[PDB]
Design a protein around this ligand. Structure first.
Ligand SMILES: N[C@@H](Cc1ccccc1)C(=O)O
Ligand SMILES: N[C@@H](Cc1ccccc1)C(=O)O
Ligand SMILES: N[C@@H](Cc1ccccc1)C(=O)O
Ligand SMILES: N[C@@H](Cc1ccccc1)C(=O)O
Ligand SMILES: [K+]
Ligand SMILES: [K+]
Ligand SMILES: [K+]
Ligand SMILES: [K+]
Lengths: 410, 509, 410, 509
């Protein structure tokens, strides 16, 4: 469809969703979803990130939840083609005042010891709050991603400085609804998602998603519409709260979130996002940035099934994700943390390569690429005769991901 | 802003809304909003259309409501610069199923609990003895159209039942979703072949009454196909031929047959709550976006209805969710938003109108007008009709010479509607001497109708200048523009002209 | 054709020119072309402007040439549908030094007395030279158009100030070839034509056009290519010199110029010219300028046969011509001078309405429009059922041409 | 500059050319330019291709010219960073008609005057007795293909005759355009069905000689249709299969059948002067623009030839008109410009090469590169061929990270040609070990070929790095870029790769 309007006119409620669900699903784990058996089913149904709410519970309790999450996750490790990484997120209590309380310091230190992937930092009002959280995590927690939660007016007013200091953003709509009038929160949500998309940083929408599923096996029309519109605004991930933490239908909530998010993909008009993001980006001569733009460009032309990115830290894959290709970004990494953290970005499908490093660099690249091809075929992103883009460095120890290759799927 | 993304990035919740609210507000009038004094305040606060729900009330009652609406409306007629036309809409009963009266004395509500049994009866002895065990309803054929396993929804989806056993004139059900059952509530039978007619005997009488009362539009309930629309058209007849028919899409068949319904109707109402019963929750937002899109493409008005500001029945302010849902209907492309119980029977009818106005006005800052137009221009079929070429040219000019308004001199409204299809940012000031045309124009996004009551000058060019000067005064007073801005003026050429084919670029003096 | 490249690829030398010749033809009148009988044939064959070279001849001699031009021109006046206005141009001797010599002053005064339409001012080096010519023409000659001839390096270096002071420009390629190297004159030509197009002022290419036709009935391949390329650069008019003044085939020269210019129209890609001219124009709220842009825009959409402009001074038609529509601009005027001067602009087909003024303004407009419709049908610009754009003012005595009308051809 | 118009407005005759000359220069070698010392100077001054005209001379003579060209070319081989490849082109005689020898002793020229009679004879007694009354020519069938009223042109259109009477073996004509008639001049019969074969007995021998001499390309004369091209291809055979065939379009039939000729050929030469005889003057500029356009769209080389700098046969500087005509051929999209008598037999062969270089270099300032590419990208068919996608991506990147060059490692040249089709601003440094590939690359606008003479490294990645480093040194020395600039590098992935499908963004060390 050559216009957004025609894209809307062609939507059909009777035809099933042909496209993959490209947004992350974050689920809050509590008494209802804590057991290894429930977590297994939640992972199969689409959970990408387990969130632990440190407003409640002891460290002993959370250590057991984390252990259960990992037991459930690694139960699928025996098939590396189908294995999905699952991230762990620590959501701080925060001030209920200083940015980091005595309790938050202890909780953050515990997160470092437990090897969590990301921190959702509560009640962030300004940049210096983010830097205080960074300082507590320290040298040992330096690769842990900090997602600043915008929960009040000051957070919204000072958004630009908070965004620049953070690794990502969580929009807490319910908390914003208390301090900001109802007729304005939807504008704040749209503003913040937009600015995050422009900056290439993850944005999560949270609170008041599928709350009615705490008691019911299906959500309301309004809730489906609200979740869908967060996806269409440009959210990278959607987070579920009590629905998965303590409700009666945690597994049904994950499945419904998956269905809604997958339906919303049919309303996304991908070409416009990219053309605007390409024009708004500053003119640069950084090799990686030029290669990322070129890859997304090629992914729209030679109607590509995927952009395969070989990445150690995830950074190269994130640079591609900023431009919002339609094609999935298969991020191949040997770093387990990188694979878990990648779920924060819309359209990144991380895969953890567990094979050992080959001495000949070109053979090692070919092995990781072949692994990505098998994963893509199995997930139905592409098949034999399709073409994909492959991004790598040139030589072992390259700082740039500056090599782009157009490759037919064998 | 040259990109949609930058348009979103520049949104600021602290800066007040610089732009006008361009969508229509339709309010349902009932016991809470019926009086001349309340209506006056609702009109000042932004009500453009009064909706009368003929599911309830006698013709005598509705005649008095209509009279009160007109008394309130004409109380502002002494200042023709500030006078706002107010339309009247008749919303038909249609093929409804309803429950009976709650039993006994005391509170007129009973708690139905999940897992509990409930017998549905058609025995008229129980018509006014509804309770936790027995529920009467008025659809006699219900046992022929429903099976074991069928779902039955009561009171706009509040309560749900599953049929466990059929009988001759009864059904034993189990309550799936509990709630308070009141008296005379609406019943939906999803996936059931309900044999009730499109226009009942009662609907015929109601439609004839609407013609006699000179209503501006009809909201036709439960439209399933084009022939239902044509039956409504036939009843309105020659005498009601200028009354606009808005088809309500309330079920799956309505959505499946949307194209034929749209082509037969003057416009569409999307009833989201009713659609939520028959269609899964994960799909209704797609149906809403599809239908609004197709209406925008066809140049026909689309109204979003149900589940707008329902919490304001009891509270002076809406929830964050409701604000977000209303706003998104506006951003999808809705021409109007309709309020139901919030204005009809709730405790804060005036606050509901004001909040709807605030939400809709805030949503305008998120609308990216240039994209809508560029796409609507490309999707329109290549034509040599003078009026269509002039309408496109006017909207084009309204984006270039950053225009404060497109002024359209129109008798029937049609010329102004053709401009509105292209979705200019600038307001369309539709100047007309026809009072009905001025009322009906509120159905279209971005049309600000003004009723010129001055007599016709013999020299045509002087008459045009007089109507344009009237539009200029109205625009200055509403803050659309001021001295030094430029406006587009569309007219015919000569008094007999069939086309609105003349465009004029005019500085505001 | 949606691209310039495809426009070139579709050119067909075997199909005849479907489009009108939109550039003006200026012919130098001398001993070979001076007679009433030859002028008649030159006018029928396409001459729009008669140029008189005041380097030679007495005032008596030139008065007779002017009289012969007018006798020939008015011989077609009995049919006002087919009558073509013919302009008279005085080309000064100039310095062969002050801008205006004693001789030039006398020649310019004679031009005012003879009611010439335009002056081609020789050897213009700077703006003050143009203002001296303006001062000599004075109040009585204030509507006479001054075309500055750029004949040397200083003229090119100071082009912007000369252009701003002049009504139009003549590029004298042969004279430029003496003072500027041959490998650079083509750049000067392209630069000057471009700047004139951007400013909305007429530009004429002169010298070394069809010189071989002084002795031969047909031009060379090279000369055809050179004339054609001046048209494709954006020239409004092409001027012939000795070919028509003193050569053996003056009538054949006019006809060949017409054929070359008409062939060149097939290579003009009109949509690009307009889209660029629209973007480069400064953002304004002048009603006439907005209406002119809108008219040209509409002329590309409702595939218009013409833009009809009712104009007293010509200015409204010139403002439309700046945007380079494909459709011919039929400029209807009662002012005989306006009709003659309009030939300086590419794409303007002037028509002189000789009917008396109707008292009712709307009827007078309708009469002039009907006249334009008959002229257009007769010239084959359009026929019954086509649609045209009509531009007018609103009341009698309107300063703006701010009214645009889409009109089917009856 | 964001518009073509502004690009023209900013042209400045006082500022020197900042950019390289990107079009090829082809020079005809004859008595004036034949010596090793002159060729050396012509190569330094910018000659990329030496053309040998086989209309005249023996094979012995041409073998010596070819040897001199190679001696001159290889004299610069001692510095492989600065060495420029020089191609050799064989231009066939084809089906030509020629006059005989001028009579008697004295001057070898006679004045034919307008209105005078001239008898054309086929009697071989008059073969060497041509004068004002009698002219012999070598086309025996001429009387069968010409009528009364037919025009006959002699010596590249200098003289024109009209046939007044036919005979068995004679034609009586009247001279229309007079001039000096010399010996053995070319004869054109416009609109006549000349039955001469596409490849004559002589052309077969000349083409076989070209294969033996290892020429790089053939300019095939008087190509009228695709089958003529295939006959030339067949004669070159298996041994001459990599020799490029450039079809010369010299008549109306060539233009009418252009598409099939283009599809059969490796490239095209537009012979404007020859076209000017058979096609009217007011149409040849359209044919030139059409043919260049179609060649650009197809990605095949197009050369403009004839009537370039002809006045430099006698003068050290060209005319304004000639400079303008050459410049406009470049701006139309020509890949190369060919010089004829200016370099073959004139008094200033070296000055002609230098002036051609200056004109072509000046014309680069008027080229608007971004438009060419954006249109060529849109007009190209949607494909999934890896090399084509990579070529487009490389040119795209060359406009963004303001690249100094696109470096392409290529064996046959094909990968570099695929990049050249998209018309990047940045030079395409085509690195090859194949000497023929390096010579043939000059046919394409914007390809700067470099011949790597270093031996192949066993490790593929090291070999790539070596060739890339060689290209970097060549680019630094030519001033295309310096340390800190960024370039695009295209290669295969692995030594067995069929595709050039790997693109690398590389800072210049
Ligand atoms: N990152 C999420 C969502 C996703 C799915 C498929 C492709 C891209 C993204 C996942 O791996 O499940
Ligand atoms: N038609 C509505 C909404 C509107 C307001 C302002 C401008 C345009 C439209 C009204 O008149 O109030
Ligand atoms: N102005 C010239 C050329 C022209 C012809 C036709 C249309 C537009 C322009 C004329 O009137 O003859
Ligand atoms: N191919 C020619 C012209 C050229 C020069 C520089 C860059 C590109 C092309 C050469 O190598 O000399
Ligand atoms: K928390
Ligand atoms: K109703
Ligand atoms: K002169
Ligand atoms: K030859």
């Amino acid at each position: 469809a050559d216009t957004f309007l025609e894209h809307m006119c062609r939507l059909d409620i009777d035809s099933p969703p042909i496209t993959a669900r490209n947004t992350g699903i974050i689920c809050t784990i509590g008494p209802a979803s804590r057991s290894v058996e429930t977590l297994k089913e939640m992972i199969k149904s689409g959970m990408n990130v387990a969130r632990l709410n440190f407003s409640h519970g002891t460290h002993e309790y959370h250590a057991e939840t984390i252990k259960n999450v990992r037991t459930a996750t690694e139960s699928f490790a025996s098939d590396p083609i189908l294995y999905r990484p699952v991230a762990v997120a620590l959501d701080t209590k925060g001030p209920e005042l200083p940015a980091v309380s005595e309790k938050d310091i202890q909780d953050l230190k515990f997160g470092v010891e437990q090897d969590v992937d990301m921190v959702f930092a509560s009640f962030i009002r300004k940049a210096s709050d983010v830097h205080e959280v960074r300082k507590v995590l320290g040298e040992k927690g330096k690769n842990i991603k900090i997602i600043s939660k915008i929960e009040n007016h000051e957070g919204v007013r000072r958004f630009d400085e908070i965004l620049e200091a953070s690794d990502g953003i969580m929009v807490a709509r319910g908390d914003l609804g208390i301090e900001i009038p109802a007729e304005k929160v939807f504008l704040a949500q749209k503003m913040m998602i937009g600015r995050c998309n422009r900056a290439g940083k993850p944005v999560i929408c949270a609170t008041q998603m599928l709350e009615s599923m705490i008691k019911k096996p299906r959500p309301t029309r309004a809730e489906g519409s609200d979740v869908a519109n967060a996806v269409l605004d440009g959210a990278d991930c959607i987070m579920l709260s009590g629905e998965t933490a303590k409700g009666d239908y945690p597994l049904e909530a994950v499945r419904m979130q998956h269905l809604i998010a997958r339906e919303a993909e049919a309303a996304i008009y991908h070409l416009q996002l990219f053309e605007e993001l390409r024009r708004l980006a500053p003119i640069t001569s950084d090799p990686t940035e030029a290669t990322a733009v070129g890859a997304v460009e090629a992914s729209f032309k030679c109607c590509s099934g995927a952009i395969i990115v070989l990445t150690k830290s995830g950074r190269s894959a994130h640079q591609v994700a900023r431009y919002r290709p339609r094609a999935p970004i298969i991020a191949v990494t040997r770093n387990p943390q990188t694979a878990r953290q990648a779920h924060l970005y819309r359209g990144i499908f991380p895969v953890l390569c567990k094979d050992p490093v080959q001495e000949a660099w070109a053979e090692d690249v070919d092995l990781r690429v072949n692994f990505a091809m098998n994963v893509g075929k199995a997930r139905g992103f592409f098949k034999k005769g399709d073409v994909v883009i492959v991004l790598t460095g040139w030589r072992p120890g390259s700082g740039f991901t500056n090599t782009m290759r157009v490759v037919p799927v064998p």
